[PDB]
Subunit: 186 residues, 4 copies
Amino acid sequence: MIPDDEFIKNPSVPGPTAMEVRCLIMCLAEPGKNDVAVDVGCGTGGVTLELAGRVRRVYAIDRNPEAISTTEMNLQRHGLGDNVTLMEGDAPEALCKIPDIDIAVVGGSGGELQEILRIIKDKLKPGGRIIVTAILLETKFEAMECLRDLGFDVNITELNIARGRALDRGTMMVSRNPVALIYTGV
Amino acid sequence: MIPDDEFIKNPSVPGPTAMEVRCLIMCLAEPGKNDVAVDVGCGTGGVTLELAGRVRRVYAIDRNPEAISTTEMNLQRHGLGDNVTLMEGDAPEALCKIPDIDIAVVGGSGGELQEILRIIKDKLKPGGRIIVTAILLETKFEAMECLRDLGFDVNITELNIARGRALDRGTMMVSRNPVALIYTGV
Amino acid sequence: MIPDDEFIKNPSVPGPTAMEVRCLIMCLAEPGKNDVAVDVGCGTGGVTLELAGRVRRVYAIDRNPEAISTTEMNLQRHGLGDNVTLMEGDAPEALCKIPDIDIAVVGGSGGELQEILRIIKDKLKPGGRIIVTAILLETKFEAMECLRDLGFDVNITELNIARGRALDRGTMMVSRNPVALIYTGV
Amino acid sequence: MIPDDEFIKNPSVPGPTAMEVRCLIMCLAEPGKNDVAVDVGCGTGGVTLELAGRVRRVYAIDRNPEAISTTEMNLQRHGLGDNVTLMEGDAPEALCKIPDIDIAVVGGSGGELQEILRIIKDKLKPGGRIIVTAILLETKFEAMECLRDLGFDVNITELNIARGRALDRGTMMVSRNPVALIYTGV
């Protein structure tokens, strides 16, 4: 999989999602070659890149123009993007213009999490999966609550990752901020 | 991916490796359909199962007969194993009888880690990858050291995973023991 | 400090709080010899024992009779308890019958967290401290929210602890479930 | 206890040790008012400050002059230091010039960990305690090994701490790098 260091970064754009998290998102999503996926809040394009090479169509959404731009660049550098529809603008509006989906990954909730999830529920193909990426303590709670209130069986996994950094004196373990994945049953 | 609960367990056999770890091993291994892989210390068969459905040939090794047996069962229950060669007996001896490999995953080091790694280095095809699973503090150190002394560029990632358990009162987070992955460059 | 293994346990009573957590609670509480403290949901008595030997008076509350019982026992085995008032029954009622407090530690929220916190706010002596122990994801959120809505400056710290277990083959790290401490400014 | 933010920091000097770690070091050390303690690799002075206000004498050692300097400053700002002997220079040499000790905390091993521990073993008063702070993977291993080879019963505890950071959108959990504490029996 593409490591964090091989991504094009931008100051106003957060990400990429740590590779270890992207790895788990892919496993929970269970991407099929005929699946249609949406990535709400694509940021640097980490999740978009991985999905792109595994499903039929990927719709990448973000309010931040810089994010659409960075995702666009990372897509090209790795020769993907032919099956990716980039969409700038407000998440709720953009989601209304999209076909039904098999996989929905919601990163930057952008405050409108509850609305985004309701909309996503109305477009979810049977057997579809929703995966919410949470950095804020409130998102972990809000996501769990919404998904349960929309009738899904909800689960949550928190990851704490430490990678070794080679120093002269030795290998020191460097932490990544904890990331929680709230996901609905398959 | 196959979740931990859908595996056939045995008392004298450890595992399965937590799904989140198996997920990362697969990502680091970058399994190609024409790759030959070896799984030293296959245990319950977690890694063997995942590799089986993605590479050309998998050689699963373990000293413990119960492990070969459990791996065998889990393979059957999921309709895999046609491309898996099970091998009971001492790791170093078994490795000498195997073709050259593209991917090597070393779980249960079984004390002979240093020797196993040397042997694996002599059979690694160019561009091959080695991934060592460490539970013991000594294995983390020893693996790092050996691989470096064998001339590889070594990395290490520690994972701390917590999964939510639905209780009546609410969702409590339950921890998994930390697991470290020591891996060589691609 | 008293280690987890030197506590008398009971089936229906959770605890003791991991020593590493009890250690941080004591540090955040800043127990003075003339302070009056309340321990809501005392469980096995871990926090009660530590406070007992450092403040003037400790009021230990729990609905579960077994818990009051276990706390009672652990208090005796360590020769403390002269300055501890045990109180069985519903937390909100019991809190109404107690003097004003300098330190309040709330363990087993027992569903009535919001009410317990309001009450505790009305009895808090100036410069007092509140520390909420959270195991459930909802308690972390609810505590943060209540305390903020009651006008306190709120903080949160999550601890993930692993202790080494000496095995014949080596030292394996064993995890404790994550525990969060939500506390108000001093 | 003194929070991380109330310390004077310096570029070339690492620390302060996270408060949650300092809290546990104090608990493992069990500082008595008549104890003599040594802090090898005092850095910003975190451990030195805490020990200062609890034992009879504290000998703070560090090769880095800037560290001695920073510790000196933090001591003053909190009105401590009357019972602290600062010592610049190479750890092994400095330790030879100190009285026997009750408590020894070794932070910045500075490569000479093995020698430092040997020396410390020869000056440890009966019932004395040694606590080694490890950031590097190699130190965790080396400390465990040395202390065992010097005849102590060794233990290890790894802490992963996350603190909440109030943002407008909510409270995001921010991680601290993992820290291991290797300590000998009391």
